[PDB]
């Protein structure tokens, strides 16, 4: 197959950008679905097949990143670049050196010094490049080279930048947190005054991946970020009763959950938790349902004797739920555990807690008795 590679490739010498373009997108193509061969058949004289094609495509990405000069072409490798790193992973990362010349390579987007407000969806699509490889490299082998990372993106974070730079800055460094995921412990000194000082630009998606970046951060915190727990509370819960806006106030759901379940000893105390629900639904931001749906789970599974004092919110928010098609399914099944948790044990109790449901709505739920 190095045949139509070979014959692709020099095709990246035409005047034209549109075909440059449609030839590194393709040849990227080429090794996504030649990594989708090597799992059929495993065995392997397409391995090196597939070798034999990451070793000069992949440079061939590095070295366009630094040296073509069109914009768009930049912006095509750069996805089609994250989409080789999603799909095969450490094949792509094999031969030596290769992590520290693809991490110098999104360094010299971040810096501005390559051959060329495009600036802001080249600094995005660097910042898709960025979470893929910590994915790939595993958060551990990584993890030094996001110290690399990290001034750079502190730098688009401060006062002065466009808020297009700050929203890349603080959701690259989210998805990045959890890319590292339990190697983030080492990065939470140094991580958290940004995401504390962004938290309060006026700025909605600035704001919705400020607390969106704390509360991944108090998941795969490993540890030393719960030491700030009763900090990041001190600013989430005032933050969520002043919220005006949609979008900020599903990703604080979505971040006092997580760090609700971070703990396993201590904040499970019922002002946190019923501000929480209280909160509920969520309105704009639907991928914090699977959170929240999570948190449901934990709640059941650990300290189950809180949802008696919650019982007429999980029934005033249950009520509502299940009508929504765009409710993941599983969201729902964990709220109707807890709700049947209230139903045997703690039994009139819960039988009271439906008594503040619309009596039309209090038996559809009694639909699944």
């Known amino acids: ?87 095969c992973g450490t094949l792509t990362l094999k031969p030596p050196g290769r992590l520290a010349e693809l991490c110098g390579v999104l360094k010299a987007v971040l810096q501005r010094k390559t051959a060329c407000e495009y600036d802001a969806m080249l600094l995005e699509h660097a910042g898709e490049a960025i979470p893929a490889l910590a994915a790939a490299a595993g958060g551990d082998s990584f993890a030094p080279f996001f110290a690399g990372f990290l001034p750079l993106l502190v730098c688009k974070t401060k006062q002065g930048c466009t808020v297009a730079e700050k929203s890349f800055a603080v959701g690259t460094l989210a998805e990045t947190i959890q890319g590292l995921g339990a190697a983030s412990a080492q990065f939470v ?48 819960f005032p933050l969520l009763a002043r919220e005006r806006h949609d979008r900020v106030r599903d990703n604080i759901c979505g971040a006092l959950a997580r760090l609700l379940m971070a703990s396993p000893t201590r904040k499970p105390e019922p002002q946190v938790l019923a501000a929480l629900l209280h909160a509920l639904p969520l309105k704009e931001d639907l991928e914090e349902w699977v959170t929240i749906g999570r948190l449901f789970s934990f709640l059941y599974q ?34 109707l555990l807890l709700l049947t948790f209230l139903a045997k044990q703690h039994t009139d109790s819960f039988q009271a807690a439906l008594g503040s449901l619309p009596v039309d709505k209090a038996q559809e739920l009694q639909a699944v008795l």
């Not at 029934?315 to 969201?331: G, H």
Request: glycine residues 4%.
């Open 1 to 87: 197959m190095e045949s139509v590679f070979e014959e692709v490739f020099k095709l990246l010498e035409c005047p034209h950008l549109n075909v440059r373009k449609a030839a590194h997108e393709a040849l990227g193509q080429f090794c996504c679905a030649l990594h989708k061969a090597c799992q059929s058949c495993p065995s392997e004289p397409n391995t090196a097949a597939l070798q034999a094609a990451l070793a000069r495509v992949v440079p061939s990405y590095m070295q366009a990143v630094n040296r073509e000069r069109e914009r768009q072409v930049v912006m095509a490798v750069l996805e089609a670049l994250t989409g080789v790193l999603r799909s």
């Open 189 to 236: 000194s140094r991580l958290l005054p940004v995401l504390l000082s962004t938290a309060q630009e006026a700025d909605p998606e600035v704001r919705s991946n400020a607390i969106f970046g704390m509360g991944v951060l108090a998941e795969h915190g490993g540890h030393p970020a719960q030491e700030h727990f009763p900090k990041l509370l001190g600013l989430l």
């Open 302 to 335: 650990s300290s189950p004797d809180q949802v008696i004092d919650v019982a007429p919110e999980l029934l005033r928010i249950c009520s509502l739920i299940l009508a929504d098609n765009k409710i993941p399914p599983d969201t729902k099944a964990a709220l």
